[PDB]
Design a protein around this nucleic acid. Structure first.
Lengths: 69, 109, 90, 106, 95, 134
RNA sequence: AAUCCGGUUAAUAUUCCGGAACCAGAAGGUGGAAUCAACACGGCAACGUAAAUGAAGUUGGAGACGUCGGCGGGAGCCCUGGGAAGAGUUCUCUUUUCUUUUUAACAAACCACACCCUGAAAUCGGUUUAUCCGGAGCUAGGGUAUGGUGUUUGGAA
């Protein structure tokens, strides 16, 4: 698995056709994990900020399959 | 009113700062309290941070990799941007660590 | 000084006879003693195998063909002198 | 907790190397590991080369060229001191043979 | 034996450097006049020093003893493979 | 004083090991940036290939092209050599200011390249342009 | 050459299931890099960098190696001080007795005997449990390399 530290990188990989699905994981420390299943790697972005979390979630392309915890 | 401080046609000089090497780049903090001075020749002490309020100079880096070409201060945060020969490294000064490294893909910055 | 006569052959205990342990004592002292390197002057030549004397000195690392228990033998020294004499008269 | 071999090879050999791990299920288990890699030796002095990792022979094929070499003459084949001795000895003996050629041509 | 005596007088009167790197600096700067090389010196090192000396027109002497003997002749308690004489002072080893 | 501006030498340490260089200017005293006896040199990074009576002028010129380099080198890493190479085009063009100024570094490198072109074509210092086989 | 964890059957699992990787081979594609100064730059150097054409021929390395002895590092285990969940004991005593407190391959970043640089050492110093080392350059100072069964995060709660 790969960790992505850049939000726009996460969007770019999500835009790429190899992206298959996305998971949003809400942890007990109010930190969210945006995980993106690609052909080769599970790309994970750890967003500790709430406001950046849902603007990213609405930033995700509508065609992509986003799934709850 | 590291680097040593010392206190003419209107030469109103205030505080001369002497450094081991020839400083190449100068940067100012937003609050005017920190001065960043960089020299490419040196290594251990290539860049020096000067606190005017304390009237002191120090080297915020224990070990430096690559010759430092330039330096500047982040405009929303105290982070220091160090432009080395090939990389650009982001340093958080309050916690004294390395945030990000930019791979410029450049032979000389 | 812990042993009076046996020395290095004290590791053999009381066995094999006094004379045989005596002959081994001469040879084992020769076999294990450190020798001055003819190439780097350091006292760094030690025996790897019978007839092979290697120097552990940094930068020299020379390996020598020599005697079984000593770096140089009397027969080799004597004949080297004669061979030098023969080449000079030729 | 006791462990077992993960393979049908008993007899701890130089190829049956194992390691103890704690699994996320709270289990003590063996992981079978390979023999350690080797830094390439120098061709003249025989010492390990500086700047190259310690991989297995087939494992070297996955590195890029710069990771398997040093940017110098004979880089990845000879050490720095070995190369320097090659350079000096080559130049000096060429100078010697030039002098001998000058002496013998007359 | 006379060369040993001249060396001993040189180290009490004149100026010198003892060792490979100090020798190379003196040859490079041209201040070296005469060069002692031990008999057991590496053949590559001797030829390199001889090339240095003929570039800087310095005399070369190949000391008959090894570096241990050269160090003893120097009066110091370490073996010396090569030295450079810049001035002999009262001694006349240069000629 | 065997290392003078205009003396041919060999480099034994670094990337350009075994290459023949000409001492452009010696800083035997040393410098603050280089606290040792360094000397700036210009050398041949890629030696020109051998040429023959045959082959057209295109191929001969293609094989006669030379790639130079300029570098500050320690004395202990340089091996001095009896041959000497001199030309007024390469006197005083290099300095510390040239190394700090990268455009001047590239300009000096190109000037050294061109100067080596006329020198090779004119057939001078054939030994200097012959690679050393070690 | 290259696979791990959890789960699953009445009986099979590194093989199935879920999740997460990896190897080799093949083709062209996309993005970047070199090139009209043809085949990249930086570092005094050890050498570094995401790239950075190399045929025939030759050469080198790895593969690839005994046995014994102590020394040092890591991992698991053992041990242990608190916290939290249940459980045993409780005539009396015991802020306690016990159990559960877990984190894989893989991915990224990080991390000092050899080597380099300056400097020249006897009132000789450095140094191991074990006396080796130094004018063939010690000590000291600053660097380079090696780099997980280490740390931090992803996997992953």
């Amino acid at each position: 698995p790969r960790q992505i530290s850049d939000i726009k990188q996460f969007l770019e990989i999500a835009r790429r056709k190899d992206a298959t699905s996305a998971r949003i994981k809400k942890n007990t420390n109010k930190d969210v994990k945006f995980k993106l299943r690609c052909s080769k790697y599970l790309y994970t972005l750890v967003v500790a900020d709430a406001k950046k979390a849902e603007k990213l979630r609405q930033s995700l392309p509508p065609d992509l399959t986003v799934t709850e915890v | 009113t590291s680097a040593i401080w010392r206190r003419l046609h209107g030469g109103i000089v205030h505080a001369t700062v002497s450094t081991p090497s020839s400083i190449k780049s100068l940067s100012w903090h937003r609050r005017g309290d920190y001065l960043a001075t960089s020299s490419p020749t040196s290594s251990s002490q290539a860049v020096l941070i000067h606190q005017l309020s304390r009237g002191a100079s120090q080297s915020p880096f224990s070990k430096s990799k690559g010759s430092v070409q330039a330096v500047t201060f982040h405009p929303t945060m105290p982070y220091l941007l160090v432009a080395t020969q090939r990389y650009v490294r982001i340093y958080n000064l309050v916690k004294q660590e390395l945030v990000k490294t930019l791979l410029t893909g450049v032979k000389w910055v | 000084k812990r042993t009076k006569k046996v020395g290095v052959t004290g590791k053999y205990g009381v066995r094999y006879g006094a004379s045989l342990r005596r002959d081994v004592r001469k040879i084992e002292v020769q076999q294990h003693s450190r020798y001055q390197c003819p190439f780097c002057g350091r006292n760094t030549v030690k025996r790897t195998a019978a007839g092979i004397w290697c120097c552990n000195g940094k930068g020299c690392k020379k390996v020598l063909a020599g005697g079984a228990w000593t770096v140089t033998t009397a027969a080799a020294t004597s004949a080297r002198s004669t061979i030098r004499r023969l080449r000079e008269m030729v | 907790q006791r462990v077992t071999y993960r393979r049908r090879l008993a007899y701890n050999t130089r190829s049956n190397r194992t390691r103890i791990i704690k699994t996320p299920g709270n289990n003590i288990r063996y992981l079978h590991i390979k023999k350690l890699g080797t830094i390439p030796r120098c061709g003249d002095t025989g010492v390990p080369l500086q700047g190259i990792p310690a991989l297995r022979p087939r494992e070297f094929a996955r590195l890029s060229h710069n990771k398997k070499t040093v940017q110098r003459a004979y880089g990845g084949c000879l050490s720095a001191n070995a190369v320097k001795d090659r350079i000096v000895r080559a130049f000096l003996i060429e100078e010697q043979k030039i002098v001998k050629q000058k002496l013998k041509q007359l | 034996d006379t060369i040993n005596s001249k060396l001993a007088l040189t180290m009490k009167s004149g100026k010198y450097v003892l060792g490979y790197k100090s020798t190379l600096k003196t040859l490079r700067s041209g201040k070296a006049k005469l060069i002692l090389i031990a008999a057991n010196a590496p053949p590559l090192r001797k030829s390199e020093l001889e090339y240095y000396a003929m570039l800087s027109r310095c005399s070369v002497h190949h000391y008959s003893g090894n570096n241990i003997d050269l160090g003893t002749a120097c009066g110091k308690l370490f073996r010396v493979g090569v030295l450079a004489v810049i001035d002999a002072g009262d001694s006349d080893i240069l000629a | 004083k065997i290392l003078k501006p205009g003396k041919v030498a060999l480099i034994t340490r670094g990337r350009f090991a075994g290459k023949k260089v000409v001492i452009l200017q010696a800083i035997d005293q040393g410098s603050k940036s280089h606290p040792f006896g360094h000397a700036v040199v210009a050398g041949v990074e890629r030696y020109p290939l051998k040429v023959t009576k045959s082959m057209g002028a295109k191929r001969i010129a293609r094989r006669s092209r030379v790639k130079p380099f300029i570098k500050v080198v320690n004395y202990n890493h340089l091996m001095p050599t009896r041959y000497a190479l001199e030309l007024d085009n390469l006197k005083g063009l290099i300095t510390a200011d040239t190394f700090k100024e990268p455009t001047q570094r590239s300009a000096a490198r190109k000037t050294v390249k061109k100067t080596f072109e006329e020198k090779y074509q004119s057939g001078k210092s054939a030994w200097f342009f012959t690679p050393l086989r070690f």
